[PDB]
Amino acid sequence: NNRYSFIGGRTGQWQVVKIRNVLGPGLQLVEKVNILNGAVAEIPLDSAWRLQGFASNIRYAIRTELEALQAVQPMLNRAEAILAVLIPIKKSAQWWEMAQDERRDIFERESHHTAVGLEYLPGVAARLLHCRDLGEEFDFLTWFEFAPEHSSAFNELLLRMRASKEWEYVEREVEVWLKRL
Amino acid sequence: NNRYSFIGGRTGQWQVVKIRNVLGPGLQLVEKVNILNGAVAEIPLDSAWRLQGFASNIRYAIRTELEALQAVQPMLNRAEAILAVLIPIKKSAQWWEMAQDERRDIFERESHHTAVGLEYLPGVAARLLHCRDLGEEFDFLTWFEFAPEHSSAFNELLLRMRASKEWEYVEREVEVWLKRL
Ligand code: HEM
Ligand code: HEM
Incomplete structure (x- = not known):
């Protein structure tokens, strides 16, 4: 199953440290985030919101970039990795109307997202x-x-990405900062 | 809503003319196809199969190709366009493992799909x-x-596509020929 749900509420594997409403409408503060490898039909009764998405194929990365990523990408659930951040992002209608070469050029040639x-x-x-x-x-x-x-390094990464040409097309963004329970 | 369902059965807006099971497991012959704008969890007991998919953003076409397409592409639902063909297609795992430059290269440079x-x-x-x-x-x-x-022109197009490098990665294909009721 390539579908995942993130339910903000009173149960979950992750405790919410803070929510920063970076751009556009935020997300209601909740105690925890519950992550499920499947679709959940409705938001639970005692929960505040449900986000969902699917894992998919590569859209922009070229073979040499994939090779570099897979060489260093760490697994999930490392013993030491007790902090997490969930960052839902929405891009503008002007972004989605662009052609594939136009979006690839902004993504990597102009913004160096992968590099x-x-x-x-x-x-x-x-x-x-x-x-x-x-x-x-x-x-x-x-x-x-x-x-x-x-x-501190992750905050530096965020600083760099939010200044990129690509981020001129981000129109909604929220940071849910988490600590492993 | 960008989700569409296609229900093969006894009712619908389109009459089945023929089903050509080109490659791999076919689709059961049915009388009609009902097209619905949205997801449908269950189908009538009279129905034999349900297909579904969503409209999405451009994945390969570059700006100059979009411009050429927009200059000649017809609209759906022309009064004269009383024939339709629904062609479900599945590509191989080898295709989906490839990076974006690798798939684009096969799609257009080698197969001239858009041209x-x-x-x-x-x-x-x-x-x-x-x-x-x-x-x-x-x-x-x-x-x-x-x-x-x-x-006859459409059948010729099919012949040319099925001979392309890109189609070497197609592992299941069915043609549902339809007439507008
Ligand atoms: C930590 C190191 C990171 C690496 C190695 C990385 C790498 C990548 C790559 C290779 C893609 C393209 C995937 C594809 O081709 O389909 C991508 C997509 C994306 N990444 Fe990053 N990224 C990183 C950090 C971040 C951060 C910090 C954010 C948000 C603050 C972010 C947000 C996104 C988004 C929104 C997309 C989708 C772009 C689109 O499809 O328009 N990434 N990332
Ligand atoms: C009739 C004239 C046709 C034109 C102008 C055309 C053009 C295109 C273009 C530009 C794309 C890229 C869409 C994108 O960038 O996301 C595409 C994708 C595709 N077309 Fe065609 N095409 C035609 C006929 C056909 C036929 C006859 C078939 C099948 C029998 C077909 C099957 C596909 C498939 C499966 C894709 C998706 C490819 C992928 O994402 O791997 N097309 N077409």
Whole structure:
């Protein structure tokens, strides 16, 4: 199953440390996030929101970039990786109307998204889910986990990405900061 | 809503003319296809199969190709376009493991998918739905409609595509020929 749900509520594997509503409408503060490898039909009664997305095929990375990523990408659930961040992201209609070469050029040629990100592996385990096609309010769910010693580096990564040409097309973004229970 | 379901059975807006089980397991012959804008969990007991997929963003076409397509592409639902063909397609695992530059290279540089297809517009209207990400048995639902005068031209297009490098990665394919009721 390539579908995952993130339920904000009073149960889950992750305790919410804080929620930062970076751009556009935020997400209601909750105690925990519950991650499930499947679709959940309705938001539970005592829960505040449900996000969902699916794992999918590569859209932009070229073979040499994939080879570099797979060489350093860490697994999930490392013993030391007790911190995580869930960052749902929505991109603008102007982004989605662009052609494939236009979006690839902004993504890598102009913003160096992969090249910049590669600097912060193997410290940071990063994963991507897609959800525009499900009709969700966000387009992507991005997931990161790392040990506390890499907290400052991860903030530096965020600083760099938010200044990139690609981020001129981000129109909604929320950070859910988490600690493993 | 970008989700569409295709229910093969006794009712629908389209009459089945024939089903050509081109490659791999076919689809049961039915009287009609009912097309619904949205997901459907269950189908009538009278129905034999359900297909589903979603409309999505461009994955391969570059700006100059989009410009050429927009200049000649017809709209769906032309009064004259009383014939349609629903062609579900599944590509191999080897295809999906490839990186984005590798798949683009096969799609256009080697197979001339868009260049060949442009030769059959404006006669043929077309739409692409995606469903690998939904866990479906096919990867794509492709849709084509045209006036009867263009049936032989469409069959020629099929012949040219099935001979391309890209089609060496197609592992399941069915043609559901339809007439608008
Ligand atoms: C930590 C190191 C990172 C690496 C190695 C990395 C690498 C990548 C790669 C290779 C892709 C393209 C996947 C594809 O071709 O389908 C991608 C997509 C994406 N990443 Fe990153 N990334 C990193 C960090 C981040 C961060 C910090 C964020 C958000 C703050 C982020 C948000 C996204 C989004 C939204 C996409 C989807 C882009 C689109 O399809 O338009 N990534 N990432
Ligand atoms: C009739 C004229 C046609 C034109 C102008 C055309 C053009 C295109 C274009 C530009 C794309 C890329 C869409 C994107 O970038 O996301 C595409 C994708 C596709 N087309 Fe066609 N095409 C035609 C006919 C056909 C036929 C006859 C078939 C099957 C029998 C077909 C099957 C597909 C499939 C399966 C894809 C998705 C490829 C993938 O994502 O791997 N097309 N077409």
